Amino acid sequence: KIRTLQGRVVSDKMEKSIVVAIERFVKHPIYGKFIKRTTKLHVHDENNECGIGDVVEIRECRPLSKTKSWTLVRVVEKAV
Amino acid sequence: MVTIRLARHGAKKRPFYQVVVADSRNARNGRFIERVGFFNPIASEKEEGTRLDLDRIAHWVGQGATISDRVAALIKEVNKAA
């Protein structure tokens, strides 16, 4: 592939309007401590299947909707 | 059209040109694509004064670029090979 991310779902409840979380860890640029910098993304999933709490793999595509530039590629785990 | 030309970074009454490939419409001493030589018109007999990367130049030229009246003059003066 050309790059891809994962992250837990967080919201399935809308017609292919799947939104995914992406936690990271980063050195605070000033005080060292590592801290969590989350990223939410509006990703397309056709035929709605990814479910709230599902870890999932994601790729970056052209603009689907205003907001959407990412489609899923695979799923990973469920029933959290 | 892209062009090779003399950008002029000299100094009052002691000019010293940086020959450069760029977008013909940009400012003389402004945005360029790459430097491909330099031409010291004071140079003098001593040594250096017109180093000119002929390999890129005549690659751009073929690539599509064009050349100044006063650059092509440096080339049929540099001779080319010897």
Place this chain on the structure above:
Amino acid sequence: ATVNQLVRKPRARKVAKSNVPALEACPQKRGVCTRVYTTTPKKPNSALRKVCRVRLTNGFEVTSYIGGEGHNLQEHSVILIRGGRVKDLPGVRYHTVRGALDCSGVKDRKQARSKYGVKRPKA
């Protein structure tokens, strides 16, 4: 203390008030003389210090010191003022540039003439 703490609320650097609202960082400002006073100084000292209140080009109406010995300066005199408190006259925070606009230079000064705007006497 804690790295969390500092992370949550970073360290902030006390910003500095001036001591001379000659507005916007100005070397000096022009003003007109509202009053030409001479009040007396604080504790240890005792004297009759010449001063003046000045409406400044930028609105501010402030009191400034008139340096030297003697001066023709009155109401409606157009002067120039610079930074420089006078600890003796609390609340006086500016000095008048002797020898500027309508301000005379100190008469007969031979030493330190450039302060107290005095021209080089004819040798």
Place this chain on the structure above:
Amino acid sequence: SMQDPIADMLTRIRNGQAANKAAVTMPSSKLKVAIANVLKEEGFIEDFKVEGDTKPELELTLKYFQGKAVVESIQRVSRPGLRIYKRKDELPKVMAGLGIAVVSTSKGVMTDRAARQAGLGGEIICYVA
């Protein structure tokens, strides 16, 4: 509350030392061990020992040279609150070379002297001189 074991070591030492105490015990762990190692290897203590199975128990023998102790200063460097990671070219060197800095790399818990040689980096556990 016992949220940093390694500082509890670094310190059980530090104190016991300043108390001219010969022995020193504590609950053990793989990580505790690997350090006791470098401390022995590099020679800041006589030798360690783990006695038990259910509830393992690190035991360290303190060195004393002259009147003094051999460990002049044992100090945590990384820690739960604020973790540290230097690359290879940015690994620290304690006391200008003398004494050392423990560091954990992907290839085990070594010294700075080591990790520099090993050409890699890690989390600088603590300093010891």
Place this chain on the structure above:
Amino acid sequence: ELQEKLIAVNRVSKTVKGGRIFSFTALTVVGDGNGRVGFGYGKAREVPAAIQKAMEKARRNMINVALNNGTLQHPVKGVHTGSRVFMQPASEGTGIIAGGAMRAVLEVAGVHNVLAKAYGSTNPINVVRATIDGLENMNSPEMVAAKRGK
């Protein structure tokens, strides 16, 4: 190679029925030029008396420090009362830049090329002192091996 210098002389007052009786204090540093440096304090009703009564104190009260040629081996921190001092090897270009007052102890000591600064109070009697203990705690660029090797 006697090499000595006083760092600070000061006046103090005692206050008695009849008024303030004054006096002075000198604080001095003597060093051989090859390790071995001591400071002395000593006070006396008049200045010469004290500055001298001091120089002596220093001749006794003298420590010695394991140099490494012109410099220290590693960097060291010292800290007495309200002075926290820090000085550093510094692969000499010139060196000997430091807070004149610990420049004193440093040159008589024989270090030739260090950088230092003093934090906290620059109270002389506690910097020159903080630094002495500083240099003092310093240790054998070899005989850490003494400690170890074993």
Place this chain on the structure above:
Amino acid sequence: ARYLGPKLKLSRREGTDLFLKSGVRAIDTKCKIEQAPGQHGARKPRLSDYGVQLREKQKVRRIYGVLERQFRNYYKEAARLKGNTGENLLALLEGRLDNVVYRMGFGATRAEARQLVSHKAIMVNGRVVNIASYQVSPNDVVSIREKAKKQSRVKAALELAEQREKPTWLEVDAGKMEGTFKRKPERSDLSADINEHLIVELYSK
């Protein structure tokens, strides 16, 4: 630019000869050196460290006839140039043409030797260099221009030039009136009575 005032006054305050009347007589007197640079010149200045630190660099400065601007910049340069600030200072300070001129004896005083430069009557490797601070370097060759060669001053100049210790890093002629800067004067050449690391301390804080 140039100091221009009473020359001896300086030496007297600086406490040592600076060779500003360099000419004829020697070991001053015929002057009054020491005990009265002024009205209170006699009095002993129990002067501070800053005092001594100031007067050393002031001394070196009154020596080469150099103002604060240039001097500060020599220092700046020295410090940059690898290896001991305080020495390079002196190196630079000797690489001065006007100095090399006086040093080769073409001028009685450093000043005179300078006026010579200013008056296009000197030539490095051939061409005229009329600017006092021109930096002279190894193998360079300075010669009086024929135009005004063997003229009053320079004769006597080259004369009592031998009265002096006579340098080392260079090579006079006195016939062709040329001289070759052989090598950058080592530390050990010159000095003793000048203590750099002070004027280093001065310009170090």
Place this chain on the structure above:
RNA sequence: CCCGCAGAAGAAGCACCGGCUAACUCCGUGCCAGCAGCCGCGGUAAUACGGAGGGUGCAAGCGUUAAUCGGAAUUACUGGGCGUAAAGCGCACGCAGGCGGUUUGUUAAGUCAGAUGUGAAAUCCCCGGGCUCAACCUGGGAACUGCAUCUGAUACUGGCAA
């Protein structure tokens, strides 16, 4: 840029000198006049006011004002503090958050490694070269301590399992 010409001829001023801070005397004045970056000088011997002579520092500039950083470890990440000096909420419980004993496996996000691309030129720095020197101009390196992709490593941290 070069050559001749005349005559030293046309070319020095500003701040300071009580301490911090390099530089001291006299005269005037007398809590007045006035000084003052800070401390503080002035009521009859003022090195602190004003003038003078002398001196110190700068010099075609010199001072004054304004302005940023510095020293200031005086917002302390490097690098600080809270018993009596500024500073522990009157006390508890606890959500979020932060942190978390110990073992094995797996994970490989943090972390670490390497490779690759990229990080405009100028600038800064190093060695040069060019203007009488210099400022200035200029060849070439170095540096851009960053970012991103791929591949690795798995001690530590994170996830997962027991």
Place this chain on the structure above:
RNA sequence: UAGCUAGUAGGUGGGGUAACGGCUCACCUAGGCGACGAUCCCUAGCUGGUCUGAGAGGAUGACCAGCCACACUGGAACUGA
């Protein structure tokens, strides 16, 4: 300043653009954003870099170069690559 949001968030189709696209429309879903700071308020062109500092930092964005924006003020399009 603790809530904000109706083309708002997403879907389906037509339209549309040089092009992907709530860009537009109709219909459907009830979504979307937010204490890792939304919304609101105040200030502001960003950068390479500049000055300072041993550094880390602090301060700053004239002159040179890059990007953006504006052209008396608000609005609009026409011509044209």
